[PDB]
Each structure stands twice: as structure tokens, then as C-alpha cells.
């Protein structure tokens, strides 16, 4: 209750159950319960570059092409960021924004330096005792009455203002998703001429409540060259990026959203006399016997598990197929640039159109692959996005094949992706392909 209290022990003194289950995200999750989200099952780390090998080629040229693991329980958020391969920490102090309760005051005390400083200096702004402290009670609760509060004013509230949302019209069921939307959103780190971070914002420009489309997000990402954060190595393109857009995906006219279901309904199941205790061991619903689903569905865990995986398998199929396709188009751009050096002249108009389409498909495939539900959050929308990804890839592929053939180059029907070179010997730790972790096309 007292002002200035970050210490979760003070908050949990009168809330022992919530305090205990909150701590319990430290526990390893049960193995063999989820098909696609196995992070920290039996303590294992899951390498997304080994589950989805094409991203090892597509994300090559910055941190995401070196180390990129499945997510774990909340308590590890700072620790896992501490041990991630240093390539990912090139984003600097901006990377504290959704990880430590110190982020708001540090942003407000350092100004632009908060984002632009090195990650190490950023962590050293935090007291040593608190430098591994993950999301705490104060991050989603106000200390006067408890009850949901958006701590992340400088990101989520600013984005909501961009959308024209009236904060005085936000219900508690809204906040039962908005407290997660403080971090389970896609973001942009604008960079200056030295490629140093200037801000963190959610690219919700020109979007409305319940309608943050991938089309709108892409249009914002394209709108400014400060929004180019990395260079794709295989293509040499300076590109923007999309990260874990759970809130944008789920709230975009999905079935459960339109039914009024909040993140917490599925991820914070409750136990009830008149006194309510919500489970704060936030995890995959597949891994706590669907206890949240069963508060509105009277079906067995077996029935619900079947519904989820039936949907995820179709979506994962399209994701993998469009992913190999986009990697093929990247390899085709590599060929194009190697032919340009060898004097072959390429039609500038077909090249420009292919590049535009390739970006459209890439950002679509990335929106899906970055999202942590494998389509279950918004099934048909996810498929729509992947379908367009598939479309745009084809457009780019065909264009490059024509233009290259018009310049006299022989384009093989099968482009070799050489994924072994991208999946292995990654970074300082020389991370290797783990073939047992590959999530193969369920319909291939």
C-alpha cells in the first residue's frame, strides 16, 4: 500500500495467494501438454531458429538471427534478457521498457538517454539488488485500492491516445487486457543517424480500438526512415520490424474479443464464497488443464485441446510454407545483387515492385510468427495475413525470376536455401541447430 513501494513483498503481505502464484512463474512448465509453445517445459530452452529454420535465414544480420527463444514465466524476464546473446541487446536502454518496474521513472529521469544508452549502462541505473526484478504488482495494480492500473504511460497510454481512445471510458474488462497490452504488443524503436535508439512507441497510428490491422501497422512502419532498425544480411535491405503483437492480433475483431473475453479470462483463471483469487502463474492454458476455458465451456480438456491444435496446425502450415517462400525470395534478391556486380543489368521497375511485395509479405509472415498463439487468438485473421504473405511472396518471386531471366541469368527451379549455414555457428555462443526442435509442416 505505501507510496514509493516497488518491493513485491510489501504488496503481497496481505495477498499471499496472488503473491505465491505470481512467484510461481519461476516453476518449470509441464512437458508434453502444448504442441507449439514449450518454453521452459521441464526447464528446456526452445530455439525458434531451430523450430522454424527459415527465420534463421530471414533474420540474419542482427540479433534475431542469432538467438531467439520461446518465452518463459514472468519472473525470468530480466534474467533472460541478461543472458541473451549480446546482439539482441544492441537495442540498448530502450530494451528495459517492458521488463523492469523501473522503466517509467528511468525513462522520465533520463529522457532520450534512457533509450540511447547502452543496455549495460541502462541496467546500472537500477539498484544492484533489483536488476533482475521482473514485472511486479505495481506494474498492473495501483497501490491505493489494488485494481488494475496502466503503469506504462509513456508507451501504452500514448498509443491509446493516438487511437482516440478515451481513458475515462475504459472498463475493468478492458483493463483485464490492457495491463498485458503494456508489453504484448508490437513496437518500433526509431533510430538516429548513428543507428542509436530514440524512443519506444506502438505503431497504432491511424488505427481504432478493436481494429489494429497489419495493413495499418505496415503503413506506419514504411512512413519514416528512422524506423529502419536493421540490415537483412542476405538481401542487404534496411528493414523495420514487428514483435509479439498479441494485443493487436487478438483485439482485431476476433471471436473471443467480440465476445468480450479478456486476456485474463484465459491466462489468469480464478478460484471463487464471495472472495475471488486469480491465478497469477500466467502460462499457456494448455498447461493448466484449460481451467480458464472451463469457466465458459463445459467441455473436457481433451475436447478443448483438440480445438486449439486443429486450428494451430492449419495456421502453422501456412506460416511454414510462406516462410520458406519468403526465404527463397531473399535468396533471389541475393542472386540479383550478385548478378548486378557481374555486370548484368536488371529491370529497375520489376526490381522495385518485387522489393515492395517482398516487404509486404515479409512483414505479414513476421506478424504471424512473432505472435505467440499460432493463430488461436484470431484464427481467420491470422490465416488472412498468411494468405496475403503467400500472395506477396509469389508476386516478388515471379517478378525476380522474369527480370533475372530477361537479363540472361539462369534461375534454377529450386533455389538452394543452405539453411545449415544460417542455423549453425550462431554468434558468440556458437549456437547450433537442434533438429529435434524443428516444428515441421503438419500437412507436408
Taking CB under 8 A as the rule, does residue 405 contact a copy of itself? yes
Q: How far apart are CA 22 and CA 17, in angstroms?
A: 8
Total chain residues near ligand HEC (CB under 6 A) = 93
**Distances, alpha carbon 350 to alpha carbons 282, 356, 357, 425, in Å:** 48, 10, 11, 35
Taking CB under 8 A as the rule, does residue 443 contact a copy of itself? yes
Q: How far apart are CA 235 and CA 179, in angstroms?
A: 38
Residue number with CB closer to a copy of itself (408 or 435): 408
Q: Which does 191 bind (CB under 5 to 8 A by kind): a copy of itself, ligand HEC, none?
A: none
Beta bridge partners of 148: 141
Using CB under 8 A, pick the residue from 30, 86, 228, 398 that binds a copy of itself: 398
Count Cβ atoms within 10 A of the Cβ of residue 398 and give its class: 0-12 exposed, 13-18 middle, 19 or more buried. middle
CB of 408 to ligand HEC, least distance (A): 43
**Distances, alpha carbon 189 to alpha carbons 60, 93, 186, in Å:** 19, 11, 10
Residue number with CB closer to ligand HEC (71 or 398): 71
Map residues 294-313 to x or -, x wherever contact with a copy of itself holds by CB under 8 A: -----x---x--xx--xx--
What are φ and ψ of residue 122, in 5° steps?
-55, -50
Q: Which does 135 bind (CB under 5 to 8 A by kind): a copy of itself, ligand HEC, none?
A: ligand HEC
Taking CB under 8 A as the rule, does residue 126 contact a copy of itself? no
Q: How far apart are CA 436 and CA 423, in angstroms?
A: 13
Q: Which does 196 bind (CB under 5 to 8 A by kind): a copy of itself, ligand HEC, none?
A: none
Residue number with CB closer to a copy of itself (218 or 399): 399
Q: Which does 49 bind (CB under 5 to 8 A by kind): a copy of itself, ligand HEC, none?
A: none
Pick the closest to residue 86 from 422, 433, 427, 421 (CA basis). Answer: 427
Q: Is 337 annotated as a binding residue?
A: no
Handedness of CA 129, 131, 132, 133 (dihedral sign): positive
Taking CB under 6 A as the rule, does residue 227 contact ligand HEC? no
Please list, in sequence order, all residues whose beta carbon lies within 8 angstroms of the beta carbon of residue 218, skipping any fewer than 6 positions away.
359, 360, 363, 364
Contact residues for a copy of itself, defined by CB under 8 A: 215, 253, 255, 258-259, 299, 303, 306-307, 310-311, 314-315, 317-318, 321-322, 325, 349-350, 353, 375, 379-381, 383-384, 386-388, 390-391, 393-395, 397-399, 401-402, 405-406, 411, 413, 443
Amino acid at each position: 500500500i505505501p507510496d514509493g513501494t516497488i518491493d513485491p513483498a510489501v504488496w503481497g503481505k496481505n495477498y499471499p495467494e496472488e503473491y505465491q502464484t505470481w512467484k510461481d512463474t519461476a516453476l518449470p512448465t509441464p512437458e508434453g501438454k502444448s504442441k507449439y509453445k514449450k518454453g521452459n517445459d521441464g526447464g528446456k530452452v526452445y530455439d525458434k531458429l531451430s523450430e522454424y529454420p527459415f527465420i534463421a535465414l530471414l533474420f540474419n544480420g542482427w540479433g534475431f538471427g542469432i538467438e531467439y527463444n520461446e518465452p518463459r514465466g514472468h519472473v525470468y524476464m530480466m534474467k533472460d534478457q541478461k543472458e541473451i546473446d549480446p546482439s539482441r541487446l544492441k537495442g540498448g536502454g530502450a530494451c528495459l521498457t517492458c521488463k523492469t518496474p523501473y522503466a517509467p521513472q528511468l525513462a522520465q529521469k533520463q529522457g532520450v538517454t534512457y533509450f540511447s544508452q547502452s543496455y549495460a549502462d541502462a541496467v546500472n541505473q537500477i539498484p544492484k539488488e533489483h536488476q533482475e526484478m521482473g514485472v511486479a504488482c505495481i506494474d498492473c495494480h495501483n497501490n491505493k485500492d489494488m485494481g488494475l492500473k496502466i503503469s506504462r504511460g509513456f508507451t501504452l497510454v500514448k498509443a491509446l491516445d493516438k487511437m482516440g481512445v478515451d481513458q475515462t471510458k475504459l472498463t475493468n474488462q478492458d483493463k483485464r487486457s490492457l495491463v498485458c497490452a503494456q508489453c504484448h504488443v508490437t513496437y518500433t524503436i526509431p533510430k538516429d543517424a548513428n543507428m542509436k535508439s530514440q524512443d519506444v512507441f506502438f505503431p497504432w497510428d491511424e488505427s481504432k480500438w478493436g481494429k489494429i490491422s497489419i495493413e495499418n501497422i505496415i503503413k506506419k512502419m514504411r512512413s519514416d526512415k528512422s524506423y529502419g532498425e536493421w540490415t537483412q544480411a542476405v538481401t542487404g535491405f534496411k528493414m523495420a520490424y514487428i514483435r509479439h503483437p498479441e494485443f493487436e492480433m487478438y483485439s482485431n475483431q476476433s471471436v473471443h474479443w467480440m465476445a468480450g473475453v479478456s486476456c485474463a479470462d484465459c491466462h489468469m483463471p480464478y478460484t471463487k464464497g464471495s472472495k475471488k483469487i486469480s491465478d497469477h502463474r500466467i502460462m499457456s492454458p494448455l498447461k493448466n488443464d484449460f481451467k480458464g476455458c472451463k469457466q465458459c465451456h463445459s467441455e473436457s480438456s481433451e475436447w478443448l485441446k483438440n480445438q486449439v491444435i486443429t486450428i494451430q496446425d492449419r495456421a502453422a502450415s501456412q506460416y511454414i510454407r510462406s516462410g520458406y517462400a519468403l526465404a527463397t525470395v531473399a535468396k533471389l534478391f541475393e542472386m540479383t545483387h550478385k548478378q548486378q556486380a557481374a555486370g548484368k543489368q536488371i529491370d529497375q521497375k520489376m526490381y522495385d515492385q518485387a522489393k515492395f511485395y517482398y516487404e509486404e509479405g515479409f512483414y505479414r509472415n513476421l506478424f504471424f510468427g512473432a505472435e505467440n498463439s499460432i493463430g488461436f487468438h484470431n484464427p481467420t485473421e491470422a490465416m488472412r495475413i498468411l494468405g496475403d504473405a503467400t500472395m506477396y511472396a509469389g508476386k516478388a518471386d515471379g517478378l525476380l525470376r522474369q527480370a533475372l531471366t530477361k537479363a540472361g541469368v539462369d534461375v534454377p527451379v529450386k533455389i538452394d536455401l543452405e539453411l545449415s549455414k544460417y542455423t549453425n555457428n550462431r554468434g558468440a555462443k556458437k549456437l547450433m541447430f537442434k533438429p529435434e526442435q524443428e516444428l515441421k509442416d503438419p500437412y507436408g
